[PDB]
Symmetry: none
């Protein structure tokens, strides 16, 4: 069953209790001596234990300013069996999302209003990314080589049946040539073995690169990663500001994949409370990041920039390409929320927020203050 956890249970809980004195992550914030003694004996059907769940958080103290999650789920059951650890973490990480709250999924592009015309003079590209887990298999931190291979087989079979706009090709990391990895690097489609101690400490990098691969359609507007951080990572993208089109392709792609999985009696891990289940609690609900690479040289240096994004429930990341080298300010702006908002709602906020960012940019271009454009917190 768990000979090892049985040996640990022979020690008093406080002898096995981690020293989190110099830590700063959500796990350490919630893991009291009491909670550890209560859950340490528990195990999930696949044998995943509390010690397995929090190991990364113990190894990685986290940092100042922002905390890290410090824990992972090894399977779908982990969230139920260790809900007393995950729930407060989730409540804290997702702005007060309660154990009793419900998550609503909305993958109907028609519910999105506008967003098909983000000013191409500012929006260089649009993208929507999410993650999915296949029910019946352990998550990356825990999946065996056999499970991982079974998942890849399922993913590849389904993906190979996509045609038309989604006709594509699979590229296994194991057999990848220097030439194809160079092309994938140039198209920003490649992923390598994680270097983050956060991911490494969880066990998700075992047997690399076995059963890991990259798939993408011929037009390079739809990309799928298999067995990296989660079973599947699905990305839709393209040049320009047609977020609606990107989202539609995103939704239709996910839908066709799921139908194909359904054909084989397989389905994505999902429930009314946590939405789509993924390895890290920070990616629950929709696990969706919808963003744009937008030119904002003026606003980008403005003192209220960060403040404007926070109020629009958006977040930014800087870029390191020739684009920003010229403009002197190209940013990657996406939605900050993940759980408690539907996919349509998250994408809508990017659409809405982007329009205001552009209006503020043009306002600044004409050398005028944007004071009366400052929005109220959303």
């Amino acid at each position: 069953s768990n000979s090892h956890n049985a040996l640990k249970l022979r020690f008093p809980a406080e002898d096995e209790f981690p020293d989190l004195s110099a830590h700063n992550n959500h796990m350490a914030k919630v893991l009291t001596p009491e909670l550890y003694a209560e859950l340490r004996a528990k195990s999930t059907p696949s044998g995943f234990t509390l010690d397995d769940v929090i190991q990364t958080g113990v190894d990685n103290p986290g940092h100042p300013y922002i905390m890290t999650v410090g824990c992972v789920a090894g399977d779908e059951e982990s969230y139920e069996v260790f809900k007393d650890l995950f729930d407060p973490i989730i409540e804290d990480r997702h702005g007060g999302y309660k154990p009793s709250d419900e998550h609503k999924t909305d993958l109907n592009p028609d519910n999105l209003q506008g967003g098909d015309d983000l000013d191409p003079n500012y929006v260089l590209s649009s993208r929507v990314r999410t993650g999915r887990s296949i029910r019946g298999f352990c998550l990356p931190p825990h999946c065996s080589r056999g499970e991982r291979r079974a998942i890849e087989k399922l993913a590849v079979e389904a993906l190979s049946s996509l045609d038309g706009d989604l006709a594509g090709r699979y590229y296994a990391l194991k057999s990848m040539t220097e030439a194809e990895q160079q092309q994938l690097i140039d198209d920003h489609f490649l992923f390598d073995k994680p270097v983050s101690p956060l991911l490494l400490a969880s066990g998700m990098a075992r047997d690399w690169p076995d059963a890991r691969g990259i798939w993408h359609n011929d037009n390079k507007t739809f990309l799928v990663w298999v067995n990296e951080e989660d079973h599947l990572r699905v990305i839709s993208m393209q040049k320009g500001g047609n977020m609606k089109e990107v989202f539609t392709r995103f939704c239709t792609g996910l839908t066709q994949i799921e139908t194909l999985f359904k054909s084989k009696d397989y389905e994505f891990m999902w429930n009314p409370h946590l939405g789509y289940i993924l390895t890290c609690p920070s990616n629950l609900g929709t696990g969706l990041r919808a963003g744009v690479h937008i030119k904002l040289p003026n606003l980008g240096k403005h003192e209220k920039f960060s403040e404007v994004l926070k109020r629009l429930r958006l977040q930014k990341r800087g870029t390191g390409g020739v684009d920003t080298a010229a403009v002197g300010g190209v940013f990657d702006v996406s939605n900050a929320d993940r759980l408690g908002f539907s996919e349509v709602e998250l994408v809508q906020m990017v659409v809405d927020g982007v329009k205001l960012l552009i209006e503020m940019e043009q306002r600044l271009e004409q050398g005028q203050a944007i004071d009366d454009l400052m929005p109220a917190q959303k």
Copy 2:
């Protein structure tokens, strides 16, 4: 590295540089045998010994002031080529042995006094240092992509700074006319190096791409991005409150590091060399705390040179001098600023004594 492969087809003596009439630390240490042993090596980034000493071969230097004559291309340069750097470091940094260990101390609390040096003599005071981000090659070798990546990290980290800090970034490239003008008025604008020492090391490539300057609204904390080093942090202020200038120096610096770490990034550093920087002369603390003071009487005394060396200080407009600590490695940041505070007090004391037409010989400091 296959260019080095070709060079290795010639015997070492045929590739060995002609360093006659060269007055730099590299030239005073590199022997034909040391070259023959190290010329086939390379750091993971591919930096070679030839790359390390190129600036020292190109720049004979000056008969008087001596230069280091070499640069590090990445963090591993100081290790893979330690047999060349160690002797140079011992030579450049007052005997600092390979066995010695550097001790960093950025706690402004350990700074005894320095809160108010006589304003009648000290026009202004400032402290500055350099920093390298682990994982990226140094300015002599960094690719355009690395430089841009470094710039991305620095800007968002500096964006997160706030309080008496919190400022605006200014990319040299896309800098607007009004902006460039405004910066010159604040005396913050820096441009492409004219120094043949930097040019020869390959540090000005792609200028001004990925280069910029960030400073606070208050104009007391400044940071140069991707110039002589990944980062050049400066703290300044008119007056003689070196203590306050150093405090702001330490905090703003602790925060930057804070933000960097919060993304799995850290400054290059190790117990032996302190902070890793491009030029060996900047190792350890790479710190320079200086003040502009009026020492007219001393300025023309025959013991002014000896007095500075005694106090371990350096000088570089009525008696207006630029005095700063001379040491960089083997002394903590707190120790370096303390010597400047102590020595300055002693300099002003001697200046006054001279004004009264008195001795001062009894004030000759004991070689610190």
